[PDB]
Ligand SMILES: Cc1c(CO)cnn1-c1ccc(F)cc1
Ligand SMILES: Cc1c(CO)cnn1-c1ccc(F)cc1
Ligand SMILES: [Cl-]
């Protein structure tokens with residue numbers, strides 16, 4: 001469905017990246033976060049939920065989801081907790097050299113993934129949500 | 134254009150917030166950034182451009198836009214360089230005491246601003262409708 005996202009973590013250069021995939025489109029939002037903690041996870045989810053209609057998020061149900069913080073953020077935002085990601089690392093690989101900081105490379109990779117084309121993932125998410133509306 | 138954004142800075146609690154407004158819809162993306170520098174501005178603009186189809190930005194043309202970095206990032210992403218602050222601040226003010234960290238309060242405020250229905254469509258619904266229409 002249109003409001004359904006998957007949230008996973010992935011690790012590079014000793015750092016933690018959260019990757020959110022909009023399941024129907026393949027569109028991705030990803031960011032390096034300071035640590036894999038409830039507080040940083042909640043922050044990431046709140047950010048995502050303000051930008052797209054997030055109804056449900058499928059997660060790995062690990063340690064950073066057992067605490068009060070993520071529960072509180074999902075409650076507040078009205079979110080239920082109920083192939084793109086190796087590719088993301090591959091693109092980061094292709095572009096790593098052009099950026100000093102991993103965080104920059106991550107955002108270049110997100111850009112490339114979402115714009116690649118007859119439809120890009122970015123066009124697909126928009127069409128799907130507009131149709132739902 | 135569907136692809137036109139305005140980028141402004143605003144300041145609270147000794148911290149810098151960049152606010153991007155999609156002009157046709159009133160949809161906002163905003164984040165606290167470490168400092169108002171070319172490098173952090175470039176980073177913010179690359180993030181935005183990967184999430185929405187950014188063709189042109191209108192900025193204040195100040196110091197963080199004179200350097201090689203923002204110019205290089207905009208080149209790369211194919212971006213041309215050619216009320217909210219207050220409203221967003223008001224919502225932040227309203228929620229500030231519910232979050233420890235300003236950064237959290239900012240993202241709650243963005244959520245509220247983008248979902249608010251004054252009657253009706255929210256800004257979030259409008260941006261999606263406008264861009265979907267343009268695509269078709
Ligand atoms: C701007 C662009 C390209 C080429 O830059 C490929 N997909 N998109 C895109 C991405 C997201 C949209 F909402 C609409 C279009
Ligand atoms: C989920 C929601 C609300 C709350 O019902 C208000 N606007 N939106 C919204 C925001 C962005 C969209 F693309 C679609 C809908
Ligand atoms: Cl995780």
Ligand SMILES: [Cl-]
Pocket residue numbers: 140141142169193195197
């Ligand atoms: Cl600025």
